[PDB]
Amino acid sequence: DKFEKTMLVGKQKDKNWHFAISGASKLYPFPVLMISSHIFFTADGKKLIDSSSVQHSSRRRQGKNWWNNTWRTKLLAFIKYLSDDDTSFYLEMGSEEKVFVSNEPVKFKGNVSYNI
Amino acid sequence: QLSYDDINIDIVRLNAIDFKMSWARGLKDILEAFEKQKVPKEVADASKSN
Amino acid sequence: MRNKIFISHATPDDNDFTRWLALKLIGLGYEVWCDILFLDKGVDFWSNIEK
Amino acid sequence: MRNKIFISHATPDDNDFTRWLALKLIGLGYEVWCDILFLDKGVDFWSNIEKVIREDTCKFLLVSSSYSNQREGVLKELAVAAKVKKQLKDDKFIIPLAIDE
Amino acid sequence: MKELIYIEEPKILFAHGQKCTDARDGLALFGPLNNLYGIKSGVIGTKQGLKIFRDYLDHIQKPIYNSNSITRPMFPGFEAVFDCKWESTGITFKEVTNEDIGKFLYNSSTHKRTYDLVSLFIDKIISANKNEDENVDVWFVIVPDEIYKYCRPNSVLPKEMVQTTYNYDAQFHDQFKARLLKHTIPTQIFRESTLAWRDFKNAFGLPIRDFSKIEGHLAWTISTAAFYKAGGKPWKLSDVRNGVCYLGLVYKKVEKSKNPRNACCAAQMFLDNGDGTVFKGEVGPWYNPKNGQYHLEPKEAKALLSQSLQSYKEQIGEYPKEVFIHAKTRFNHQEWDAFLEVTPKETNLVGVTISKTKPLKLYKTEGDYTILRGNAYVVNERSAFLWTVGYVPKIQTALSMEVPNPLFIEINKGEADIKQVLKDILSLTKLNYNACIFADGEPVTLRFADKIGEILTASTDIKTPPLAFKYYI
Amino acid sequence: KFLYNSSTHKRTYDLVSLFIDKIISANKNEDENVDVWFVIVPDEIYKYCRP
Amino acid sequence: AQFHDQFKARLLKHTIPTQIFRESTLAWRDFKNAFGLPIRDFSKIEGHLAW
RNA sequence: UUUUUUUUUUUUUUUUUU
DNA sequence: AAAAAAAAAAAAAAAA
Ligand SMILES: Nc1ncnc2c1ncn2[C@@H]1O[C@H](COP(=O)(O)OP(=O)(O)OC[C@H]2O[C@H](O)[C@H](O)[C@@H]2O)[C@@H](O)[C@H]1O
Numbered sequence: 001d002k003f004e005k006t007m008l009v010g011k012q013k014d015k016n017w018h019f020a021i022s023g024a025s026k027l028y029p030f031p032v033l034m035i036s037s038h039i040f041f042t043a044d045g046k047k048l049i050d051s052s053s054v055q056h057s058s059r060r061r062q063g064k065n066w067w068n069n070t071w072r073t074k075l076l077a078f079i080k081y082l083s084d085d086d087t088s089f090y091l092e093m094g095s096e097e098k099v100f101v102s103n104e105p106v107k108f109k110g111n112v113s114y115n116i
Numbered sequence: 117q118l119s120y121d122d123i124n125i126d127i128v129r130l131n132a133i134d135f136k137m138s139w140a141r142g143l144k145d146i147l148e149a150f151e152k153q154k155v156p157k158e159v160a161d162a163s164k165s166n
Numbered sequence: 167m168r169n170k171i172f173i174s175h176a177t178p179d180d181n182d183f184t185r186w187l188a189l190k191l192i193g194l195g196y197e198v199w200c201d202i203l204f205l206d207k208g209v210d211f212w213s214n215i216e217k
Numbered sequence: 218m219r220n221k222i223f224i225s226h227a228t229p230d231d232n233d234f235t236r237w238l239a240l241k242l243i244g245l246g247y248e249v250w251c252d253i254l255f256l257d258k259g260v261d262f263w264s265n266i267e268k269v270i271r272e273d274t275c276k277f278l279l280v281s282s283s284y285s286n287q288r289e290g291v292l293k294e295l296a297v298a299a300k301v302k303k304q305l306k307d308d309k310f311i312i313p314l315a316i317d318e
Numbered sequence: 319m320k321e322l323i324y325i326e327e328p329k330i331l332f333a334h335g336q337k338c339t340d341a342r343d344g345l346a347l348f349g350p351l352n353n354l355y356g357i358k359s360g361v362i363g364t365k366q367g368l369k370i371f372r373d374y375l376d377h378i379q380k381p382i383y384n385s386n387s388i389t390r391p392m393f394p395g396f397e398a399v400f401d402c403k404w405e406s407t408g409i410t411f412k413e414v415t416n417e418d419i420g421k422f423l424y425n426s427s428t429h430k431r432t433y434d435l436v437s438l439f440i441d442k443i444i445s446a447n448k449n450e451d452e453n454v455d456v457w458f459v460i461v462p463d464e465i466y467k468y469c470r471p472n473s474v475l476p477k478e479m480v481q482t483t484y485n486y487d488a489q490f491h492d493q494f495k496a497r498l499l500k501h502t503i504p505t506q507i508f509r510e511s512t513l514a515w516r517d518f519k520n521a522f523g524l525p526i527r528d529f530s531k532i533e534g535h536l537a538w539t540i541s542t543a544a545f546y547k548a549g550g551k552p553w554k555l556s557d558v559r560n561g562v563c564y565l566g567l568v569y570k571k572v573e574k575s576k577n578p579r580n581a582c583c584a585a586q587m588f589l590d591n592g593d594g595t596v597f598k599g600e601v602g603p604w605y606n607p608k609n610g611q612y613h614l615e616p617k618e619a620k621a622l623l624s625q626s627l628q629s630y631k632e633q634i635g636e637y638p639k640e641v642f643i644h645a646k647t648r649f650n651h652q653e654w655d656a657f658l659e660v661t662p663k664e665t666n667l668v669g670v671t672i673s674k675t676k677p678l679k680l681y682k683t684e685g686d687y688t689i690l691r692g693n694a695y696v697v698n699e700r701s702a703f704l705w706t707v708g709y710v711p712k713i714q715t716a717l718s719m720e721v722p723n724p725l726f727i728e729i730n731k732g733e734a735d736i737k738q739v740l741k742d743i744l745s746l747t748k749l750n751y752n753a754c755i756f757a758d759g760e761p762v763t764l765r766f767a768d769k770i771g772e773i774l775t776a777s778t779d780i781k782t783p784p785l786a787f788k789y790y791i
Numbered sequence: 792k793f794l795y796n797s798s799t800h801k802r803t804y805d806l807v808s809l810f811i812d813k814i815i816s817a818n819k820n821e822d823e824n825v826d827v828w829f830v831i832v833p834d835e836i837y838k839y840c841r842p
Numbered sequence: 843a844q845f846h847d848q849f850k851a852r853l854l855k856h857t858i859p860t861q862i863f864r865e866s867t868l869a870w871r872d873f874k875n876a877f878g879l880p881i882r883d884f885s886k887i888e889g890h891l892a893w
Numbered sequence: 894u895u896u897u898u899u900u901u902u903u904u905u906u907u908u909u910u911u
Numbered sequence: 912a913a914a915a916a917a918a919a920a921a922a923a924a925a926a927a
């Protein structure tokens with residue numbers, strides 16, 4: 001239950017917490033695919049918890065301490081698991097035509113920083 | 117929690133300015149005492165503090 | 167001519183009040199000397215304080 | 218427990234009387250503390266004075282003379298004695314001694 | 319690779335013309351702008367709860383400390399920070415008995431129970447204001463916790479506790495501050511929870527609202543609001559240019575009248591002759607029919623803008639030269655036509671749209687922290703992204719919790735330079751008088767207008783409401 | 792403009808309105824709190840705004 | 843037609859204190875009659891006005 | 894409602910085509 | 912009566 005070097009499926013007490021992604025493309029600034037990260041919970045590892053309040057409480061109790069360094073790596077690991085090669089993957093839209101999306105997200109650049 | 121009975125030996129003779137309950141009141145006391153004893157002073161300029 | 171006001175305190179325990187009082191006294195126009203005020207420390211200052 | 222008798226005094230002058238009294242009281246089986254005879258050298262003397270007055274001084278004796286009336290050190294240790302008197306609830310904790318005619 | 323530029327962190331002015339980026343540090347050292355000799359405080363509530371208020375007022379009197387002073391500055395005490403007298407002596411106390419407050423709470427219907435519970439405070443406070451000699455600058459309402467359990471919409475009283483108006487909202491706070499508008503009285507709601515919580519415990523024994531580490535921040539949020547409600551100036555903005563007013567339009571839903579009717583509210587921000595900033599409300603509530611329009615008909619929009627230019631021309635002498643209208647919703651051209659006609663020729667009219675719905679989440683490659691607050695990604699001369707939520711180094715932590723969402727700032731109408739627009743929004747995110755924080759999520763105009771809208775949509779009989787935020791926040 | 796009127800009732804109402812409007816505006820639409828509102832009134836109005 | 847009475851009557855809804863002053867009751871020394879003495883001279887009784 | 898922020902449910906409108 | 916792209920109202924907890 002661990003792709004690359006970062007975990008995606010885990011436990012807290014009797015609740016299995018599982019990493020998930022929600023994807024959608026936008027074409028206004030650039031043709032890009034935004035991916036948002038989410039945490040879901042199961043009672044047995046296969047059947048999700050039907051109570052919305054319970055799931056919300058569990059995901060917030062998680063999201064207490066995972067910061068960037070463990071959201072980004074899990075997101076990239078899930079994307080790399082979805083990859084077809086080392087540098088990209090393809091959405092199957094036709095028998096002969098495919099939509100090539102990069103497995104590496106867009107980088108930006110900032111001229112400012114600081115230290116811990 | 118610092119009772120006046122537990123003060124060090126070198127203070128008990130000296131009058132102790134009270135900052136325990138109001139810091140501003142004690143600071144006003146300090147300013148008045150410094151003015152009375154004519155401590156050397158410069159013109160007030162908070163920009164130096166900044 | 168002696169014109170500095172020394173603020174003795176416990177540096178790792180009474181730092182905040184000393185900060186507040188020193189930053190207000192300096193703004194008021196009173197010269198203040200304290201260990202927290204000066205940035206960086208050396209072998210010299212142990213003697214410096216005394217003098 | 219408190220089993221020491223402290224003899225405050227003006228060190229520059231009154232050493233003779235205090236030494237005599239301390240020797241007499243030690244001979245009389247009473248434990249005695251004083252700077253001339255029992256203070257540990259090369260030690261924080263004010264801190265030791267505070268510790269002995271606050272903690273182990275069962276009885277306080279002040280040698281009062283023309284010098285000891287205005288000496289600073291005797292005044293400080295006298296104030297500490299007054300404070301520990303308030304702490305202990307003992308009105309007979311302190312007995313001043315009149316030496317000078 | 320796309321370039322993102324950082325706009326300078328704004329500075330807010332304090333006493334003696336001094337500048338400090340932080341508000342807590344500036345107030346804790348340099349004090350407020352004006353001198354308010356004393357705050358005569360009135361307390362209305364149960365006798366049992368008054369003990370807690372007096373204890374917490376004494377607690378505030380003594381300076382208090384946070385666990386990590388770097389993250390949140392310590393509180394040096396009200397008398398030190400604000401140099402104004404605020405004592406437990408001189409509090410005008412009105413008592414409500416447990417029996418009287420319990421007769422009304424245990425009701426089957428939420429609307430009438432809330433109406434009568436709030437009337438129980440309103441009548442007493444009106445009597446105090448209009449029948450008693452002593453003056454009360456600000457009125458604190460200490461409220462029990464069972465009320466908060468059962469004074470809110472869709473809060474169902476347990477059947478075992480049932481013992482026994484629809485033109486009013488089921489919200490205690492909104493209705494309460496709504497019905498006092500005709501009296502021009504400053505009020506502040508306190509929950510008996512928000513006060514010295516350590517008495518209140520859960521099953522585990524920990525306090526439910528356990529703030530064992532964060533007393534300093536709560537005291538900072540209480541003291542600044544109390545000072546502002548008394549008529550004092552905590553801090554002022556210094557980078558505002560001459561001849562600029564802003565206005566913030568927000569649309570809220572109204573359920574009492576058939577058709578939501580989407581009432582709109584506005585707030586102003588402009589400079590005044592001299593240096594004293596003017597930050598008031600511009601409230602002429604313009605009722606907007608249709609279920610989901612959110613766009614003003616020409617007549618009411620013209621009335622709004624005429625009122626806004628008025629309260630500037632009578633306060634400075636001449637008309638504004640540059641106006642930055644902000645809103646959560648984009649403007650249709652029908653509103654803009656009405657706006658243009660009322661304005662004179664000299665003024666340059668600008669309508670800016672601010673939104674959060676855009677799902678952008680900029681992660682960094684390495685590090686357990688978020689993006690710096692103050693960065694800006696300029697999509698084009700008309701649109702950009704500005705992270706008003708994010709990391710700032712002075713408070714030592716990011717204001718948001720997870721990786722935050724930037725603000726989509728677009729000049730929907732007018733022309734505007736993008737840099738000046740993204741420069742003033744970050745400046746506006748500083749002047750929160752309801753809470754004393756380093757900076758807030760998005761500019762205060764859209765949130766103070768949101769508050770006044772949520773309050774003014776609680777009472778139907780509101781006529782010419784006050785324009786001062788002291789009666790609202 | 793108000794005082795030099797033929798009707799004493801109308802001039803009195805206008806004078807009261809002129810002050811009360813500004814006072815109400817200050818009370819309801821201004822930030823600074825006022826405990827007591829002093830109304831300085833000239834002498835011509837005193838002599839020419841009474842029954 | 844009473845300016846004072848109507849004024850104090852109309853401000854009642856807002857529950858706001860006020861005090862009406864004539865300019866003569868104020869520093870009267872400006873106000874001079876034909877003879878050259880102040881009309882409302884209070885030179886000997888100014889302390890009571892202050893009280 | 895000392896605040897702030899992030900979610901989850903809903904619901905809702907507009908534009909188009911049958 | 913669906914499509915996505917735009918809206919606000921309310922609740923629940925966490926930590927500042
Ligand atoms: N370093 C200090 N040590 C002692 N008292 C101090 C100090 N600093 C301030 N005080 C205050 O100085 C005040 C009294 O010093 P006084 O005016 O000269 O003598 P009295 O006869 O008029 O008052 C009799 C009290 O003095 C006894 O201590 C008992 O407390 C008596 O109640 C104290 O209240 C302290 O708060």
Ligand SMILES: Nc1ncnc2c1ncn2[C@@H]1O[C@H](COP(=O)(O)OP(=O)(O)OC[C@H]2O[C@H](O)[C@H](O)[C@@H]2O)[C@@H](O)[C@H]1O
Nearest residue numbers: 225226227228229252262266285287288289290291292294
């Ligand atoms: N390194 C030293 N620094 C200061 N004094 C010293 C030192 N070494 C020895 N002394 C001696 O310490 C003495 C300082 O006494 P004083 O203040 O002048 O006059 P008092 O009558 O008020 O002293 C009475 C108490 O103070 C005493 O410490 C004892 O504890 C007494 O109980 C000097 O003789 C010094 O030669």
